[model samples]
Target: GAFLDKPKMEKHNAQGQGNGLRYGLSSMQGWRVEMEDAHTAVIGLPSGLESWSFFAVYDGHAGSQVAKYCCEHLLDHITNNQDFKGSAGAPSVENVKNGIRTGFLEIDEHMRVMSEKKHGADRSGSTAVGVLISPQHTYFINCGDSRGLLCRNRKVHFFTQDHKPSNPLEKERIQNAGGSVMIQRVNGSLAVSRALGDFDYKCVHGKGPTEQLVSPEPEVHDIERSEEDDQFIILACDGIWDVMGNEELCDFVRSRLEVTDDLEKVCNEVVDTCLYKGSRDNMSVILICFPNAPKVSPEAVKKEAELDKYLECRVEEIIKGVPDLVHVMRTLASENIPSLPPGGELASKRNVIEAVYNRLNPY
Candidate 1:
């Protein structure tokens, strides 16, 4: 709800490879006064599921307590629940989905109890979006407005729906709960109709947990795994989505993958590009690449290098012509530069252009 005079650009990054998949993540506070985003990436799940993996992003609002706690404990709640472990061997898809939903509700209730014991329930809330990848299926879990997407065959195959109060379903739920939707928000207050740990909105009497004004129940979707067609899946908070669309992000990641195998670099560029695109919110993203994800190509690499070099030369020319930082940026923006990274475009390379300008003009 507040912004700093200048954005906080420092980012937290992590990466690993396991279970025949590779993942990388980046989270940044951006212009927010506090860092409220937290993530989880576990390679081998407990309870004898070695091939399964879990990756999630939690976007916190009002405060970071709920998000931080969820990042640390949500998976445990999901897996340790009866629904998840009730199957004879590996959990079935329905079991897993049910478990994910139960986990969200369980954790939400547990956090509520903890808040009550502490005598002051935190007014914080968080939107969760994640992927639970098994050997045979990928389960997408969503609560609130954060998003997750699957890029299959190098295109946007599926993306989770954001839980905005303006949606008909969400509007009906809010109105039934004796609340009003104003200005596209729940009673002109909270932006998301579903979230975790917004205790103030969950206190309506005579309603079940899922029937509350801001329910913690998550929507879980399961897709059959296609090792040949599945490319990658992205789980990101709204900050990243606020600036780029599903197709745009998929294409950009595909282009980046062709240039380098470093997923952390790809994720960093996503957040950096979002920041440059004027997303005035905290940002977090997790990139999980499948076996069939794009690989680096020599020609693509050479083309990218050539594009960077051309941009550098153009920035030099712009500096010599104007000698003003903003002028140089606007001039480059006006010109039709070829082969800029998709999904990010010219704004993604501002740092490169700025570097060339600063070196030549000395500030």
Candidate 2:
């Protein structure tokens, strides 16, 4: 996770619609020297359960190998195991949760073997936060700091908890593993107490996998679906959370949804806004919308158009008054701008302001 001389503004985006849901995903390298983030969005499961879907965001640290591998294979591990396929007709919620738990352990063990066979273990680690959705339930899975949230009725209904070394339980586990939590990190190093790799911390003799300094076990939560109340789900890395809180993002997404149906553009605004808000880490987000997700409203659309027009006018006025671009932005920032894209504010419309400035200056 080294910082680059300059941030990478370009992004990787993808979108799909299926199973009565629409999802948009975007990932940006940002100021990082390498792109370590990876994601998975599966609309249909491989088993007889074709109605189920899965989405995950993996934030890799140190390296991307483990995250890259999990992006494609984690779902297989969760579904192919006996705990998942044992039950005959559509796995029960308990069965699905058990399978998910087992899958994390199995894959971690499998990766350990793979590392040993290669004669060199990977020092990288990644946090896994995902949601496995069935016809009747939504299972939230979290292993590290990356987060997932459920927005219902235009509010933050639920959010996955983060696993940090500073947490009481996490600190207890680290102490039991003969490691200390220093500077809020394991052994004064790794920030997360739970993640997929980082074999160096898992070598304690006589200790089980979950008892290690860095456990790979995941916490699973099952919530029944409400066609009427459920709005959308947001799965994102620390890069997004570090900049925006749960309610802020919920309101922002809801506002964006009311203006545009393009989920990809919504997700793009998420990362772009995070970049402008000064998030130094790699950014990735997956926006999964349910049937009840906010639809475009005429009032919202008109308000957005009015907001852009006002911003353009402000940019023109500021340019005529002052010659400095930063001063123009500073002037706008110093003044009160209404309806400037919640969770993003004026930073979200930097392009619009810049374009107007350039048209006037023509430099």
Candidate 3:
């Protein structure tokens, strides 16, 4: 509870792009507290062109620049790839997967070229989790530990696997490349075998190897999107996953959306709840609701309202327990009492309690 507030928090510009699809993203460099992670998404309307939408979660381990680079260029590279144009045939599911894989390598190569020309060390790298939705199919791709999940007919279906050295395929690949796995990390330098912008790992002598150092390959899955797929898709970094399991997260978001259809509030609650649960890493989440999802039942709404009332009463009780302060400096120095400025510590504690209560209540 007290841990949630320590992060350097920032909210993205929430914009409504037409069609039934709405997108919202928020991130906080929490508890350990540094803004090194970056998450981003694009919601495209059902145009005659493709009827597609894309979302990504890029988790940075060593630095933020790599993740930020992914947020800016990953999608553009995918869509602009020659394979995605469908000139040879209609954009098949395979084409989408290949386009995503190609995009990762393209970005990796771009980073390598830039680093060499600039005479800089290519040490920065990041894990990538992305989802692309078209009218007929959904494509999920991942290069590292960040994950993507699909909720079809209210059932949680995992779409991406973590490419850690612990995984058999990852281990084999690492050894093949003359690298050794340590503590689930590749060569003990990076944890995820496949990633973008790890230029330092990719460089050998004066050149970068295509598949040897920090391979850009990604595992891709193509699933048909249907009415039963009337579910929300969540793309989040390890911070949220570290604290909550897939079902736990799905159920939490489902319950919140049941009370209120506001997607933004639902997204906020997901991040807030993670913070409440003590997620120490930077936390970020994107909540993408599918077409024509069901609304919350009337009974569920009534129960949520009752829960709100009960929590409000509890907040009042918690604030009543706050110790009284005498000297201003003494009160400021006090550790047990919640920090209060001119507005009063009691009021600040009350505000914090109310925020938590509202999040829990969802009304």
Candidate 4:
């Protein structure tokens, strides 16, 4: 992965158009050996689905082929899906969810065929994080470690979870496919447990696609859109999340919009801030804005400065002075706590910490 020189960073930005809604996107290549990040933004949909908006970020590993390929083809595959009946006939949230799921599988299969024919069985693969927005509903789909997030009233309303080897079901499938998890990664080679390409991980004792070491099956989620409280949705590669936690990033963005409505500049500042915060990966961010959402009030801005401080306290409490990172993980694994009550009657931050820890049994 060595390079002759530090590759120059590249920047991309654009505005998405809608009659009453709009979006701004900014993608940048932060410190990286190569620019393997790619993104897509479409505020207006064609084929009688003009009310729909789409955006996505693709993070490629080993090479840029899969990321570039996804940017060009993912949306087209989504909109043209056989399950799609457009915004009019199939406006139901479930229908849209099915369509998005279909797109991920279809395109993943397409990558396999095309890579073999054109690239001679490429080892390159990419993670996909996408959001589809409509006046009535919103959808988030994810494969691998890239992410999709929805913000409303200065809170993270919805987000897709990353597909890591540490996830319980993911670990189960990898082991069933004759692979082992080591150091929190699939077979200790690829970092993420799921991706678009990586055909090498797909063929395991002739197992099905979803049973492979690195599966492409995405987790799809649907959220009802509300113009009243809904603010924006973000799609970004892991670089941004690596440095920025969910609340801090959301607060940072809403506050920036307070000073100015320049979504592009705010997004650019987000990427730059991540770098200054010591993010050492390729970073890309897409910011979508809503018309009727609340502006960054004084309280939300004040909460932004306190977000980092709050995290330090939480980490120290949960970590319990365990200095070594892996040792901390192992310690939390065996540390037991009561199961949460229905309706959260006994819920606490420690409850969530234990729930997360319980998931990392790693046996």
Q: What tens digits encode model 2's per-residue C-alpha lDDT throughout 1-363? A: 358998998979999999999999999999988888999998988857689899999999889988998999999999989897767877888788899989999999999899899986558888999999999999999999999999998788999999999999999989999999998889998989999988888999888999999999999999999999999999999999998999988889998999999998999899988988889899999999999999999999999889888988988877663577778888999998877877778877887787788888885
Give the Å error, residue 218, model 3. Answer: 1.4
Worst 10 residues of 1 by lDDT: 316-325
lDDT tens string, model 1, 93-144?
A: 8889899989999999999999999886569999999989899899999998
Worst 10 residues of 3 by lDDT: 339-348
lDDT (C-alpha, whole model) for all candidates: 0.90, 0.91, 0.68, 0.74
Q: RMSD for each model, in Å, please?
A: 1.2, 1.4, 7.8, 11.4
Candidate 4, residues 1-363, lDDT tens digits: the string is 664244344568888567466677777766676788998887778787777778889999998988999998998777677665545665567667777777778898988887777756447999999888777777888998888788887789988899889899999999999989998888888899989988888888878777889988878787877878888888889998987778777776766676457788777777766765557788889888888544656754465345434433444566543344445434443554332111111111232333344444323
Which candidate leads the pack in lDDT?
2
Clashing pairs in 1: none
Error of 4 at 12 (Å): 1.9
Q: Rank the candidates by lDDT, best first.
A: 2, 1, 4, 3
Candidate 2: C-alpha RMSD to true structure equals: 1.4
lDDT of 3 by residue, 198-242 (tens): 766665443345456467777889887776555778888888888
Tell me the spans in candidate 3 whose CA falls farther than 4 Å from its real position: 1-5, 13-19, 45-50, 204-210, 315-363
Give candidate 4's error at residue 62 in angstroms: 0.9
**Residue 265: error of model 4 in Å?**
0.3
* TM per prediction: 0.98, 0.97, 0.81, 0.78
